[model samples]
Target: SVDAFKILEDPKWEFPRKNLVLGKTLGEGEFGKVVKATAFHLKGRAGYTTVAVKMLKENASPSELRDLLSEFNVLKQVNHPHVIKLYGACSQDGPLLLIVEYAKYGSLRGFLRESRKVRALTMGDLISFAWQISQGMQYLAEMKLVHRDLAARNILVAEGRKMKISDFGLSRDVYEEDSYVKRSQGRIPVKWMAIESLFDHIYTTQSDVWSFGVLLWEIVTLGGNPYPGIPPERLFNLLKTGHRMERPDNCSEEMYRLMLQCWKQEPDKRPVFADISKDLEKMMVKR
Candidate 1:
């Protein structure tokens, strides 16, 4: 959405090479690797915070790097409680690092997956998670950016289960035409993508609503595999037949209905993220 070079050239968001202290490897991607890091201080900000640095490989594709920088630009433009805080980036000639806040609980997906056996999630807790994710999506909606991959894996949690949207709006921008073709053939990710996002290659806040419904399913089911027993290749066809994932066990009837609404065939029929956030907030009170 913005010029990567322009953003990196701006002194306000630049970070010196020496200030970054890299730690263990967090994960690896096609173009870059993410690592835990602690920054000394920001160029214009006051203090320091331990964050994650998504460092692009020196030989990485220039186009992907630019798209990644544009994401950092989005982080710089928007500041909200529920969104991950992006501090700054390293020089283009340097390691090509993207500095961002680190989540204590890593990703919401991992947290739920591990805690499924031992944790007995309270209604309030589940509602809070839904509310927080909704709040983040609400901000994305208002900002006019569409988060193509809105799922539990993209949501990070901190101490006290403070939720923030991470990896927001990247898939749509980074992987455009031929994005789906590039995907590996094991499992399809259509469970979170909407009808428009799938067929028309169109993305919007409403498509994000479809993802939110899947996210809610993950929260309630403690990270159940979406579209269970349904192979990835057939998921698109399944949805065309008016099939939707059944409500998760122990999930509230009210929330199940919301999920159904999100899966509507008509994109315009989906509820806006802000209104959905408010609805979750009301459910939190009901708990």
Candidate 2:
């Protein structure tokens, strides 16, 4: 069951002080900072549950609060094992605090940077990781949700390298209309974003597919930055003109072809997440 917290108007904030020892900071974004905290209250039930607490910045405005609420609503309604779960939230102070399930292995970016010398991830490992990511995306697509910001940075690895999609700040509800309205938030990660999204700021399931294609490339290349040496301003033209990132040496042929389909100029020609998942599952078994 999901827990809900009450919002108060008081400016003073007081977090649980006793039995709440803060650990290393996991991450910090434009909105807030994520820290590893231990909850001694749940000790008897789970041997000290470790949780990630995202503390919203003190200067956040009403619009920011609305966006935060949107993210909370999306996370509360959806329940996918591959998607990070929101345990609870508290808005009783100046800054909003959200409690979420903690991933031991951290973001995919950190994994790649630390493990490049170890050579720990083999071909099979990569396939399995990709499969998990596809499953998460498939679940979101099934629920008519679009993760506008799907990149390697948002992909988290839990125990045993299990992948889960995180960060719903940019997620939006997908309606059944011919065209969707673009928000003023604009584009994120232009190099990884689809051509349509970068050009028109419109988000659809197809755009999400394009981002997934870049994610696949990142996985195969051990998390190489996309569009290296290319100017950010020229990326839109390059992508719009059907130019895409070249596959790295380790990228499999089948994977390369799947990525090409995702980068197709026509959104209608792009493959859906369900099909992508099945194809990736098969690829895992064959390897």
Candidate 3:
């Protein structure tokens, strides 16, 4: 069973002063900020607890609240080690707060950004990270849920080089029989977005597979930003015309082939998450 923590009753909330502040402002996004905090508690006689406090923007709208509540509910229902662990939440009058397990190394995006110039992750590291992401995606698909927004930025690297998927605000319960139809307004990570999504915002588990392919490309390219010089309008046309970002110069042939399989113009032609995961596992062993 997942453990539940206390929720803040007051709108203006603050962590107890004595609690150790391990770090401040780990990362910031359009929604809010993440602060690293550690506290000692006697609950169940547990010695110490470390948590990441996600402080949501104060002027968040009702729609945003609904989205967040939906995300929180989904996280609470699913329990997978590779999925980001949610400790609890605190809702004050102003900013909403979520308490989660702290990822020591932070998000995959931050790591890639910092290492871009130095080429930090090797081929083995890239394969391991890709495999872990596949594992997380498989788990979510089994639950009949689709992470509408899955990108490197949402993946966290913890101790032991394990990858965990986070940020479920855009996720939704999707049926296996549902048709692919894109909707506007939902957030889609531009570079990692599936061709279908770019066309009309249509997303399915298969579309997620397409994004996964892009993620693999991102990994091999040592964190190259997608569509670097292309404009947004051109991206749609290019994808519609059966175009994909060129594989980086250093990309392995096997990795390139896998990515091409993922970017099939037709959603039905794309590989399923299960098959992708299996293929990735096999590739890792060879590496």
Candidate 4:
């Protein structure tokens, strides 16, 4: 097989290494890291643009490199205000680098957790976050792309409570976040993934709907980890036997019912993103 680097070569998405100035590390994992950086002439501007750079650690294997390259390909075709932007990438010289949009406030999970400590988030603010994520996810569904991973942790928070769905290569660090469960092949976001995906490795739009319900729960609980005190091994059997996370104490009955719709045992029985978005809209209007 030919190398992806050769096929991926293009001036449009490629940036020269000289154009970037790597800054302090924002996050890191076993095989890669994300750093704050500055890019000159990223979009042919006079000065530079602040960006987040995702790069593999030195001595990474070819397979690991492919994962990073995969993110670049997936992100290049994406263009939406609620979705992370791909400015450029550098793969020709030295290590591979994917320069993407920056979010000053960090991921939704972190933001929610901190805001809850001081009771800074109102009910309106919480609902708005969930609504924004559903809108962003609806766009991804229309694009025929399965996010595979969708959670409060993967959504970025910018100014004015603006939220963007992101993950791509950035989620490799999730291993250290303690949310993933080790499986036969690799670590999986079992708590957030759908039933079919957990058992058969089959993913579809409905699978994403499953995660959206979980994400909605996260927003309501101020980012509490789903299924607290339950081990991942026990989850499959529990879910197979018709167990689902109970409604949060403060969660409204209507929102809890929406979540139940998303967790239908039959994958196809779940609501589509369009319907979910509409329901959220009505909920927002009423409250």
Number of the top-ranking candidate, with lDDT as the measure:
4
TM-score of every model?
0.86, 0.86, 0.84, 0.89
lDDT of 2 by residue, 1-287 (tens): 33333454322223344546667888877646789987655423545678887765567555566556656667777788899877655565334666677888988877776778774777888878888999899999999988888988889888878887988877877884327533647647778777878777778888999999888888888878888888877887787666887768878888899989999999999999899889988997775
Off by over 4 Å in 4: 2-7, 59-61, 169-187
- Residue-by-residue lDDT tens digits, candidate 4, 188-265: 488987888888876667888898989999999988999987888898888899999998989989999999999899
List per-prediction Cα lDDT, in the order shown. Answer: 0.76, 0.77, 0.73, 0.80
lDDT of 3 by residue, 1-287 (tens): 33222232532233334443446888777646778876565123457788787765556555555566556667777778889877655564434566677787888877777786764577778877888889889999999888887777778877666888988878776764338633337467676778778776778888888888878876777557777888877887888887887868887788889898988988899887778888888987875
What lDDT would candidate 1 get against the real structure? Answer: 0.76
Report the number of the highest-TM-score candidate: 4
List clashing residue pairs in candidate 1.
none
Q: Which segments of model 1 are wrong by more than 4 Å? A: 1-8, 43-48, 57-59, 169-188
**Tens digit per residue, CA lDDT, model 1, 1-287:** 56544434657777887887899988775536788888876655767778888877657776567657656667877788889888787764666678887877877888888887776667788888988888887877777776677788878887777998877436443324443533322122677778776787676678778888888999888877788887766898988888888878888888899999999999888888778888888887765
Q: Rank the candidates by lDDT, best first.
A: 4, 2, 1, 3
Residue 186 in model 3: lDDT:
45
Better of 2 and 4 by TM-score: 4
Tell me the TM-score of model 4. 0.89
Decoy 1 TM-score against native: 0.86
Backbone-clash count (model 2): 0
CA error at residue 245 for candidate 3, angstroms:
1.4
